[PDB]
Write a structure and sequence with these properties.
Elements (H helix, E strand, L loop, with lengths): L12 H7 L3
Bound molecules: zinc ion.
The site of zinc ion has 6 residues, from helix 1.
Family: Belongs to the SecA family.
Protein name: Protein translocase subunit SecA
Organism: Escherichia coli (strain K12)
């Protein structure tokens, strides 16, 4: 859903930015 809140404000990005948790 292009939910890249954080300081990205976009889509997909966050998953690669704040989506990974390892
Ligand atoms: Zn981010």
């Amino acid at each position: 859903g292009r939910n890249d809140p954080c300081p990205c404000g976009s889509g997909k990005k966050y998953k690669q930015c704040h989506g990974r948790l390892q």
